[PDB]
Write a protein that binds this ligand. Structure first.
Ligand SMILES: CC(=O)N[C@@H]1[C@@H](O)[C@H](O[C@@H]2O[C@H](CO)[C@@H](O)[C@H](O)[C@H]2NC(C)=O)[C@@H](CO)O[C@H]1O
Length: 129
């Protein structure tokens, strides 16, 4: 599913992402936009043999099992395929686990690049949330 920006903002807000581990909602909309263009089916293979999955582009070396990643740890305890559904429940639960690690939201390259220190007002403008 390719989410609409406000549609995605509402689903994140409904799921407790606004302020999760001190990360306001606009943070999460901004990184979803840059990481996958709001597409739950987005996949990106890395040089190291790992692959990034879904809306949040979660990596198969540490968080999920895709069965072809060398030295994989599967910390979210899921199949990477579960990160590609239109339904965001499992993706959200795993993104919540990812942000508890020491690096917080800096775990996401797109957040570090396009969102950190930025004015993120525009990502939720007009969503009425
Ligand atoms: C969103 C995602 O899947 N991000 C990735 C980062 O988690 C991953 O960072 C690595 O995360 C581990 C788990 O918290 C850390 O123990 C490890 O220190 C770490 N490393 C760094 C190098 O910042 C990176 C790199 O594997 O990949 C991103 O895809």
């Amino acid at each position: 599913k390719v989410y609409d920006r406000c549609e995605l903002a509402r689903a994140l807000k409904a799921s407790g992402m606004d302020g999760y581990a001190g990360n306001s909602l606009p943070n999460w909309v901004c990184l979803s936009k840059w990481e996958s263009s709001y597409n739950t089916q987005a996949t990106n293979r890395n040089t190291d043999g790992s692959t990034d999955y879904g809306i949040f582009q979660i990596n198969s070396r540490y968080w999920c099992d895709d069965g072809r990643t060398p030295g994989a740890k599967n910390v979210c305890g899921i199949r990477c395929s579960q990160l590609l559904t239109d339904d965001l429940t499992v993706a959200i639960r795993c993104a919540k686990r990812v942000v508890l690690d020491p690096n917080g939201i800096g775990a996401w390259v797109a957040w570090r690049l396009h969102c950190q220190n930025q004015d993120l007002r525009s990502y939720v403008a007009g969503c009425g949330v």
